[PDB]
DNA sequence: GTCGACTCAAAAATCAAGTAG
DNA sequence: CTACTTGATTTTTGAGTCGAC
DNA sequence: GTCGACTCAAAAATCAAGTAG
DNA sequence: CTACTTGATTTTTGAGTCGAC
């Protein structure tokens, strides 16, 4: 990972892996299938990665960092948490629609590496707990358990991403977009 | 698919029950039609007399589980003091039901992979029978503004069962139990 | 070669529940082998009997002829031969139980076993008879008499009851073989 | 069996079964094959019989009775056990050719109804033992385990019945009949 | 079937890409067979080339068992080369990999040419020159025209250039 | 290159590369092998050259220019195209007897850089085609296709260059030298 | 017989860290 | 009333096949 | 060579719906 | 400042191996 070319090649393999696993799955994807996509040598996969299941771990970790950083970009504004959660919900549906064909990796994760599947949620919840408890003491949001509410807010985003993002190409209507914002505002008094 | 004689209904159930325990224990792949029919104590071919494909057993396993969860939740909600108290124990007893049906979640994981259409159906039928319950509750003025509200409440139950019932294997504390009802109260009463 | 041997070990199943009640699923499951792998090694369910009875004929004729190979009087050959048969058949209870299944499922093999066994018997019997060792009778008829006695006591005292023959009973049988074959 | 018409029709089904099972085999014969030959309704078989296997149990119980009676007929005259056995053996092989059908079915039994197969030899040996043992006390035949001798004689009859009655329509030549008469004489006559 | 499935994919890939630019991974995937299945049949990657070359030498000997002769036999060689495209391309690769086979092939092609050439010189059919040289002139002409008009281009020669080639053969052989 | 001191080290690499690639082949030749032969630092090779494969491109560029100029010396000052080919052929073979190592690397090119290999024959044909078309109308050489006759002349040169130069080293005898000229003369005589 | 993951000795390409002119 | 009779409907049965890894 | 879903050609059981005695 | 130099260091290569069905 030291050299600029070194970190480039690692990203050639990783971006090749996400396309194949999202199309044919983990089982069907061979190391040859990956390196041939990346246009690199066969043994180069084993230079950057320990084994085949280790690519999924690194795929999930990037499909967490790249999401959380994207959401933190649109939530650097107003000190009020209700405003943070108002944008953080709609922009999550915007990002999931961009990475629509990339949810099939999670299905393949719950099968082959289910431990790193639990990790994505627990790490997302960890940054939704410490960041939520800040606004809690500030009396902006409800004084309850911070960890408990994190899963409630994630669970809503998860289910919406299933129905309006994955199970429908149409998405959300303007009236429903407004309706959603009040639901967030209501359970934060 | 073919329910005429009570013996046919008996044999279909011998198959369906064996499938439920086997898929839960070792998954859809590791379970063979021989495993299903041997445990059921019926002819190998008999599985095909009632089920077109091996995949079609997941369809009827989900249907039976969905209907039995819908009845379990319909039982504890028909008496309650308006919609605000309906979602109060509707969520509460779902987390109790999920610990009773802890072993049989392995099936629902497989569903998302092998038969994702009946996985999609599970939520869409539950949402269709939730929307009717919310449309006439807004008509009374008990709860705030339709279909979107159904999925939101589903996702709360879905994720809490995933974490506090499945992963933690302990449950919810008395403190956290009370905290839940407040989220329900604040989300339905216009504050 | 282990996979074919895993399949063949079939013997346990057919001897206990019988050829009919034994399925390919039963055989392949017990063997811890794929259903289809049975058909890679065997043409049909019936072909397994042929291969089992192939081993059964080999195991027997080799063991049974080891003790009769040197004795003086043919009466002593039969007295011992009978004892060594009932002894072998207790050691190979499974293989015989499968051989019994043949009379319905592969009758041509069953009929052949007895006929080929009669040929080995008649050969030696006709010989000693002409010498004056054995009663002068039809060598083929007497051959089936001793084959019948062996098969019946094998059924009753080995298969139908795991016990066997008592030392007292063994002497009684030895007397029966002697009395019958010794010319007056 | 309450009516005389009932007993009449049962025999129609029974006789066709004997004729068919003997000819084509137990597996090859269907209930339709029996009822059509019998010239009766398909379902009528089930009015008199529990299952296809249950008809074997009745065919063998008649086979045991009819053979035991025929053999009692000729063995009653002689009051010399060696002569009783000499005749009984010939008379058995005679009855065998006369009842090839019934005996051919008895062979199938060892695989389809092994319980009644074992039963026949056991019932036959029990009646044989008490007869031989009494004749041993009279000092007519050798003093050996009577049960053992019962099976020795039974096994001879059975095997000769296979080779010289089933496997070949020929039978025993006068030389072979005389030779067999000697084998039984030499074997039972004490020295 | 598996061993033959390999060779078909193996020949088609080594022809287009070349021995080095073709990996066992490329071969097995084109053949629709497991990676390890290659090593079950062939003990080495060098060994599969030996067999393709051994197969090519069989096809060459079969053709070699058959003034105007050098005119038609020239066009018949290029017609054979177009039908054996993939196999000749693998033979060109031998020059670097196993140079002994490349040298021997041309040397044996010279022997058969020379003996048949020296008989026509005596008869007065063709002009008196070195028989070893004249043969290599005809060999080189074939190898070059086949390299350009058959191997480097899928097109061909055309009846316009076909007649022009016979005019080249005639002029250099008839005085 | 910039300095005459720097350009001095570029030729130290090239004149060491030629000596190794022609001897033990491109594959067996390493950068550590080249740099050590040049008596320089490892990386210095990459300072003057893009990649290992690019050294082949420069060596063949020099090989192409050196031959184009050497043959020009003896053919530039001529009138008859038939005689241009006669001199051109003999001096081509004379050049390779001196430059054996340079042609050996051109053989390695077919396998490692077939792009520059196919370019050489395609550009050598372009020099011939232009020169032939001028002599076609002048009545010097025979009336055929210019591209066809270009490769024909190339093929005779290429083949002889392997057999009498690379494989034997013995070269052509004075009888063979004269016999060859007769072939080229006969070929291009418009009869 | 079939499979596809993982090893390993080579030798490329690339640096940080210097010195010449 | 019970005792037989009917055939079409229904359920049952493994062995053998098939394309896949 | 190894794997397991799936077809298939019969059958055995049923049972409503009757007729005989 | 630029042009050149140095060699350990980091990356790449794809054949051959490895168990396991």
Residue numbers in the entry:
A (entry chain F): 6 to 194
B (entry chain E): 4 to 148, 151 to 196
C (entry chain B): 12 to 20, 22 to 196
D (entry chain A), F (entry chain C): 6 to 196
E (entry chain D): 13 to 78, 87 to 195
What text appears in the publication on this structure?
FadRSa, of which we show that it displays structural similarities with bacterial TetR-like FadR regulators, is an archaeal member of the widespread prokaryotic TetR family. Each subunit displays two functional domains: an N-terminal helix-turn-helix (HTH) DNA-binding domain (α1–α3) and a C-terminal domain (α4–α9) of which α8 and α9 stabilize dimerization. The finding that FadRSa represses the Saci_1103-Saci_1126 gene cluster and that it is responsive to acyl-CoA molecules acting as inducers in vitro strongly suggests that intracellularly present acyl-CoA molecules cause a derepression and thus higher transcriptional expression of the gene cluster in vivo.
To further unravel mechanisms of DNA binding by FadRSa, we determined the cocrystal structure of the protein–DNA complex to a resolution of 3.29 Å using a duplex DNA containing the predicted FadRSa binding motif in the control region of the fadRSa gene itself, corresponding to ChIP-seq peak 2. The asymmetric unit contained six FadRSa subunits, organized as three dimers, and two DNA duplex molecules thus representing a nonbiological assembly, although the protein–DNA molecular interactions within this structure are representative of the biologically relevant complexes (see below, DNA-binding stoichiometry of FadRSa). In each FadRSa subunit in the cocrystal structure, residues of the recognition helix α3 and the α2–α3 loop interact with the major groove of DNA with the establishment of an extensive number of contacts. Besides protein–DNA contacts, a weak electrostatic protein–protein contact was also observed between Asn37 residues of FadRSa dimers bound on different sides of the DNA helix. The presence of a G–C bp 11 positions upstream of the symmetrical C–G in the pseudopalindromic site appears to be the sole explanation of the preference of a second FadRSa dimer to establish an interaction with the upstream (left) and not downstream (right) side of the pseudopalindromic site. Based on the cocrystal structure, the G base of this G–C bp in the fadRSa operator can be assumed to be contacted by Gly48 that is crucial for DNA binding with the dimer-of-dimer-complex architecture reflecting that of the architecture of the AB dimer and subunit E of the DE dimer interacting with a single-DNA duplex in the cocrystal structure. A Gly48–guanine interaction and Asn37-mediated protein–protein contacts, of which the latter have never before been observed for bacterial dimer-of-dimer binding TetR-like proteins, assist in the dimer-of-dimer interaction mode.
